[PDB]
């Protein structure tokens, strides 16, 4: 009945900067607004009730403004811990509709990944499966390319990457590329390499092993 | 929850003052209590009050100095028999009882002025 | 002060979904309980509420199908969604709805306390339990070493992993699951621990797949 729209859908801003999240309502809600912080994997935490009044537990750098239909947030002196997806909600009407939500991103300093590689455990080989894993640990930005090679034979549509969200303290990423061969195809080859090229490092780094 | 009412009113020579108290509501508030307070020299006291059931009129408490008529989400409060001693700020308090959730609103108040012939 | 959701991780399509929200610190106070859901990587959606009156009078896109109630004796509220479809895959939260004194007025409500949230994936498929294998550290001393656990082939989401039954915590990286070509999920968990403490320190990963009711404690160590 009364819909909400936030903007922008996402944004970036370095640590220490001042950032604001706007949330305009269709009708007038007379400052019956709530702001929420959600770090994925957890339920959202209430920051501001009554538009401007901030909840006891929340730091003072969080503050709200606005009236009538247009309302805003403000983070004077942003911290890395504030990485989350922020939501606004009106509670002046039958359905307490949430806003679409804005995703705040830290944007840290450039950092290179620590590359690791993991051969498939013999425990797994018994079952008939063969999963060889490659680990990019703590880097920024997320834009990174990993190339799998089996006896210098490039693997293209065989891996599955899985990247974790920006860290609370490090403000970094981590990637998990897993190559999946057949038990037969696996032990019919020698060298398994994980070539990692990234902005943080000068020469593409390769971490490999010979099954034996 | 904000409730609006005239900033200032002049009571006629007869001694009749009137003011409306219109209030913001989420929608369909079956029961509402209106309560008028008189702010004298640094003290507030309830002079009249009334419940407001939707779809019908008001129901004031006996000995209430006020009488009113409804119209959606606003009541047209009139008080009779006034003289200079009764001049003060007449705040009206409105609260939504049923159905929940409960809300509570208080206006800036209508400053009623009076002078005797 | 606290509350948590309890519901089945999986439910077949076109049959009523039933949840519960066991609570503590309620009553003896003018309380109101809301229900909220959040599909994967999607925004929040408010469903309904219920107050200490027992009043469940509201409107919402789901009002047609939902049926919120309360069992005062057991201290738990029950949401019941009807004829579920793929659209109803989401994390369902229950949250206390509390009013506030602000200046002369009272009201300005907001969801004060939230629960952990129970993820329910509607699907016709059967629940498969995970196989968990080790990812041991290789021959390399110097920054430091790295090890992990591979949780493969399970359905449905989620699985939760903790190292040394919650003791390690520092330096961990448990990645999001990925849907394999087969249709079963799989994820990896990883830790970076000092090279000094490898043979003189024990490392276990505690995986738990509640939907299948399987829990495993796998020990990870070098391969001689
Ligand atoms: C308020 O009551 C008085 C007396 O009847 C009169 O002015 C009228 O009825 C009401 N005023 C308005 C503007 O509705």
Residue numbers in the entry:
A (entry chain L): 1 to 212
B (entry chain A): 3 to 119
C (entry chain H): 2 to 143, 146 to 227
What did the study's authors say about this model?
The overall structure showed a tetramer containing a CTLA-4 homodimer and two copies of the HL32-Fab molecule. HL32-Fab mainly binds strands A and G of the front β-sheet and the FG loop of CTLA-4 through its heavy chain (VH) with its heavy chain complementarity determining region 3 (HCDR3). The binding interface involves extensive hydrophobic interactions formed by a cluster of aromatic residues such as Tyr104 and Tyr105 of CTLA-4, and Tyr102, Tyr107, Tyr109, and Tyr110 from VH of the HL32-Fab.
CTLA-4 is expressed after T-cell activation and was considered a negative regulator of T-cell function, although more recent studies demonstrated that CTLA-4 controls immune tolerance by enabling regulatory T (Treg) cells to rip B7 off the antigen-presenting cells, a process termed transendocytosis. CTLA-4 has higher binding affinity to B7 ligands than CD28. It is therefore of interest to delineate how the new anti-CTLA-4 antibodies differ from ipilimumab and tremelimumab in interacting with their shared target, CTLA-4.
